[PDB]
Ligand binder design. Sequence first.
Ligand SMILES: CC(C)N(Cc1ccc(C(=O)NO)cc1)S(=O)(=O)c1cc(F)c(F)c(F)c1F
Ligand SMILES: [K+]
Ligand SMILES: [K+]
Ligand SMILES: [Zn+2]
Length: 353
Amino acid sequence: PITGLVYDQRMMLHHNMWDSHHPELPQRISRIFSRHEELRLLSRCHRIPARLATEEELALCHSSKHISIIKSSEHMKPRDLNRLGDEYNSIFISNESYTCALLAAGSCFNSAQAILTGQVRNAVAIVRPPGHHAEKDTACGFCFFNTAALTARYAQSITRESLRVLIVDWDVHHGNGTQHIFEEDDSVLYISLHRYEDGAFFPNSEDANYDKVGLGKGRGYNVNIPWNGGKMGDPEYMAAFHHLVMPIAREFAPELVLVSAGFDAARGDPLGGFQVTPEGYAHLTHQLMSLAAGRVLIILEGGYNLTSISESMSMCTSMLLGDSPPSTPLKTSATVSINNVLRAHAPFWSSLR
Ligand SMILES: CC(C)N(Cc1ccc(C(=O)NO)cc1)S(=O)(=O)c1cc(F)c(F)c(F)c1F
Ligand SMILES: [K+]
Ligand SMILES: [K+]
Ligand SMILES: [Zn+2]
């Protein structure tokens, strides 16, 4: 009945040479770690060591070319780091970026290992850079390799290839890379909540809309819950979990739950525009703990208000440790969104009928 925690300050070395105020700050992870200490959560966890992902583990989800190109940045001069970064959508690169992305992924592998070997029940991974925009063949949106996707495949690689993994992605952005990597896969259920605004919200693709339900054997195993019409918060997220995430997840009956846990839907986030509270994130975590015999790994993705993400992710760890959850009409467009997803997925999930 133990909660694992992974954090390594080396992941702070990834930085933006040209704009030291870029919102994907090194101190994102140290602020979260400090708040865990400050709230006396750290001493209640089992510390799991960070490690580098291997290049063969990266090949679970990424092409050898993508791996080689990102690895080549390790010794690039600033001019070439700027040029390579600019070939992607919203990427900055320093000489330490590749190392840090390996550390983020390997830390989560070690956390998934600790859960699956029974050394801990659940775990939290305070990692950067994030992962969920990363595609098989390209970097995107502050992400180099798809940490959560890789962790799902790593978990399958040490148990069975068809181990049922649920990925709940509550970062305010669509995890396009995660969706694409698993789009034909019935072993990995991807559920994303994200601001959409009819394609105007980053990453600006109709791939994030509710009618993208998966392909082939994966049809039904991709659930997009897209928000339109401005600011959402706890009522909308609790409703989406009650009508959609939890009924589908229970029917899927995952053997492992990964949370792509960006905290940029948080109150105070400058990039998400939403108002999910730390208590709200606590309740979302508490709900997910009812799945997979409690085998839940929470993985930091985005989230840019340092105070918001520190309080929100700490509230999640508090829930993993077994603490009692803390203590409103939906916006009309949120009801429309939830009903659109319900109609899209009732063909595949009996719990929605
Ligand atoms: C496009 C916009 C949404 N951004 C990129 C982004 C990507 C991923 C996440 C995330 O959290 N994904 O899960 C959050 C933000 S930006 O930060 O505001 C931004 C930063 C810059 F440095 C720029 F030069 C620039 F033009 C710019 F738009
Ligand atoms: K998401
Ligand atoms: K899928
Ligand atoms: Zn995000």
